[PDB]
Each structure stands twice: as C-alpha cells, then as structure tokens.
C-alpha cells in the first residue's frame, strides 16, 4: 500500500508546517512549560487550521 502513505504524508507535511509556524521546530517542539503554554501562537494561525480542517 505505497501511495496513500504519501498522500497522508503530504497532509502531515502541512502538520509539520504548522508546528514550524507555532514554535519553530519540525518535530521536537518542547514548547510547554509546566505552568501553561510558553511563547504563544502568533496572529494568523486559526484561519489556517480552519482551512486544514
């Protein structure tokens, strides 16, 4: 089942792009202090999450 792997990896590339835009990291966004989210989300994210949804 080789190709749907790559279709959903395209979607997961948009996922990694969202983590890039939020914290910077590709995968290892530490980003969470005990004591709430640090270094919060910038302007221009929620509309993109809506389109992605």
């Amino acid at each position: 089942a080789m190709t749907p792997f790559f279709w959903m990896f395209e979607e997961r590339e948009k996922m990694f792009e969202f983590y890039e835009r939020v914290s910077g990291a590709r995968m290892h966004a530490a980003y969470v202090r005990p004591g709430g989210v640090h270094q919060d989300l910038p302007l221009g994210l929620m509309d993109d999450i809506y389109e992605f949804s």
């Binding site: 989300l41 910038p42 302007l43 221009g44 994210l45 929620m46 809506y50 949804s53």
Partner: protein, 68 residues
C-alpha cells in the same frame, strides 16, 4: 491596544460526514451487459470462422486441382 488571535464571531462547519455515494450500476445489470457482449462476440466468432472454412476449402481445391 490588544491584538490577540480570536475567531471573528464563530467559524463555519467542518464536515464529519462519511462520504459514500454508492455508485453503483446495480450489478445484475452488469452481468446482463457482460453476457450480452460475450454472446455477441460468440456470434461474430461463428460467422468469421465459417467463412474462413469456406476459403480454406477453396485452398484445398487449389492443391487438389494442381497436383498431377
């Protein structure tokens, strides 16, 4: 001023529907189409093989009349 990121009044819906348009063709009809085209191929097969047998008997007659 404060310039956070809220939504503006509430966004539209995102579908959780299972999309299954169930097309289709009512497969008993597909059996009918397959058997019909298959039988038409059989009739064409019959016609061409018997005309070619007429021609091959003409080839037999050629070798028979040419032999002595």
């Amino acid at each position: 001023v404060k310039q956070d990121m809220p939504p503006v009044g509430g966004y539209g819906p995102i579908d959780y529907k299972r999309n299954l348009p169930r097309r289709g063709l009512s497969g008993y009809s597909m059996f009918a189409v397959g058997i019909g085209a298959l039988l038409f191929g059989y009739w064409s097969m019959m016609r061409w093989n018997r005309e070619r047998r007429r021609l091959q008997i003409e080839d037999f007659e050629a070798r028979i009349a040419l032999m002595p």
